[PDB]
User: Fold this.
Amino acid sequence: PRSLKKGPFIDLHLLKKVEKAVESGDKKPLRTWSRRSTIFPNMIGLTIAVHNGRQHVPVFVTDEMVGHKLGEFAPTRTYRGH
Amino acid sequence: MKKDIHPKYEEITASCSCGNVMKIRSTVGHDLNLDVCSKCHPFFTGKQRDVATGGRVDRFNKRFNI
Amino acid sequence: AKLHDYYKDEVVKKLMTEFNYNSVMQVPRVEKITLNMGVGEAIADKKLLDNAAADLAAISGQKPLITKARKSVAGFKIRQGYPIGCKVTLRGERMWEFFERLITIAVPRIRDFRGLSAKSFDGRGNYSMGVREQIIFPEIDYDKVDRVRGLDITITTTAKSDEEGRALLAAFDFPFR
Amino acid sequence: ARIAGINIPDHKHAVIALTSIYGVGKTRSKAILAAAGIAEDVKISELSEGQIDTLRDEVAKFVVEGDLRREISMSIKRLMDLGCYRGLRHRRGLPVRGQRTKTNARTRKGPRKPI
RNA sequence: UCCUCCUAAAGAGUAACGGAGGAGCACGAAGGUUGGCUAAUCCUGGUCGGACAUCAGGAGGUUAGUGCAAUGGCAUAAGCC
RNA sequence: ACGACCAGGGCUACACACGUGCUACAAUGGCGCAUACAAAGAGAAGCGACCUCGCGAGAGCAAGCGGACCUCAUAAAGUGCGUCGUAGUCCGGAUUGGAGUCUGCAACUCGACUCCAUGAAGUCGGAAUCGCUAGUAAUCGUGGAUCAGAAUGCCACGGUG
Ligand SMILES: [Mg+2]
Ligand SMILES: [Mg+2]
Ligand SMILES: [Mg+2]
Ligand SMILES: [Mg+2]
Ligand SMILES: [Mg+2]
Ligand SMILES: [Mg+2]
Ligand SMILES: [Mg+2]
Ligand SMILES: [Mg+2]
Ligand SMILES: [Mg+2]
Ligand SMILES: [Mg+2]
Ligand SMILES: [Mg+2]
Ligand SMILES: [Mg+2]
Ligand SMILES: [Mg+2]
Ligand SMILES: [Mg+2]
Ligand SMILES: [Mg+2]
Ligand SMILES: [Mg+2]
Ligand SMILES: [Mg+2]
Ligand SMILES: [Mg+2]
Ligand SMILES: [Zn+2]
Assistant:
């Protein structure tokens, strides 16, 4: 975890983009190459698409996810089984 | 009821620590207490306690703000 | 006899009101309490039969029935006439003095107790229920159980439907849900 | 002896004996016996009875056997049923906190197991 | 050599290298009598209990059983204590 | 383009096998209290004592030092008094959940650390094999290099012997 007294992390290029994209409403999936942001409560109910290493993977974000960071719904290396 | 082959049956006190004095016949012999009394038991006042879900907005805005 | 002193005087005063009845016969009545604690594992020792014929006898004061297997199954190592089951039946006032020890003491005593679910009436109001362990009837010494094996209380009553037989037990605040 | 859900052995001391509950170790086990006015080398036997009558009051203000197991196995199922990375490392049966699994993941992977 | 149904033509009987099956024992009760009781099977509920152990009603009514082959019997049971 | 800049992944995946090490399987030992004796190093974007807040990692304030001056720094094994009584154990700490601290643009894949829970596997280890001839093997702690944070290995010095 972070130190608390610095506050949570989020990029500016996703914070300003998400405050624009709430107030323009469109569920065209917002893509991002920034998989290290703490998801904020006013990001509840959005379809973003985080990079995983190859392409974006879409993530529809609910109330339950808002503690975590955007990486933990993009599993990185593929695995099927030997 | 056959007269012999069934065991003993005598009245014994079964009090609880919350104050439910009672008498019941059994074969236990000794005075037997009680821990849990269903006249104040946590089933009608104490099974809310587990749910512990919480809004994630609440776990967010309990520790800091913006 | 205490719950039956409660019953005939202060249950009909609700079960005559809420269900539009003419006589005192139309209300359901309890019939019998049966206690099956079957030992399906007594082929390796006869002691596991007779101890399971004593460990529920010490709960409610009757010597029980060593009931036998009815027909034959090749799979579970049974034939006609293997004593595998143990049964107690209670009627009348001993039914009430056991129902007291169930619903006053042995119902909250069970580990992780969170009520007993609202559908066990087999469509005719005749109840069924099942404990998982014996010491929750508090009439046993602690370290004097050879194994742990539950029984199943079955309250056969003169209930007629699932809607109309449940309220009898719920009049004794049966911890449903 | 019968304290807070399940029994407690009597021959052991108070501090080592109270750890038989699910959810007390050697910190809450001295919190109880210093917020209820008991010593620490008297047994469950040769106590009095009112000491248990207030020890049972002290213990049940925490979360104990029912509540702990339901909360822990609630949070595990919650972490499973989103897609979280701890969720996938739960529902594959592999170590979660970033262990090396080229060898030595055996505590999650059970036994040593040929093909 | 003996036993059961069919061919056998509505009574008995009626054959072939014709069509199918069982016996050459058991039981000190599995016998006499008195008293009492009633099934196979599936649905539903239930401690480990599963499609099939035991327990509860409940449908249904010999579709079950006879120490063994079939055939004929069998509730007054000749079935089961 | 086999050149060059940038964000995000990757070397850390795992059905398995081998090699090297650490911690144990306990009484010559766990835990709690008091009590003595070392050596060799390092430090200015650094080492950071005293004092206060915190259960604890540590944030708060600000002296001291280019150092036989000041710091890091308390040695641990031991000795004395308790407790423990052969148990998967007050043995062992694996794995998992909840809450936190610090360096750092940033600890999700992947950081160390402290508290509250959880308490697996293991009762001296098969064939075969490894090191050592005196301050040696066996156990005990401390420092350094690389380093914003991050070694149970590496390189050093002593304590019992
Ligand atoms: Mg605990
Ligand atoms: Mg602990
Ligand atoms: Mg004829
Ligand atoms: Mg016969
Ligand atoms: Mg069924
Ligand atoms: Mg007869
Ligand atoms: Mg790069
Ligand atoms: Mg590598
Ligand atoms: Mg190996
Ligand atoms: Mg000690
Ligand atoms: Mg340094
Ligand atoms: Mg302080
Ligand atoms: Mg320990
Ligand atoms: Mg802990
Ligand atoms: Mg073992
Ligand atoms: Mg031993
Ligand atoms: Mg370093
Ligand atoms: Mg040395
Ligand atoms: Zn109480």
Observations:
- The radius of gyration of chain A is 13 Å.
- The longest strand of chain A covers residues 46-51.
- The first helix of chain A runs from residue 12 to 22.
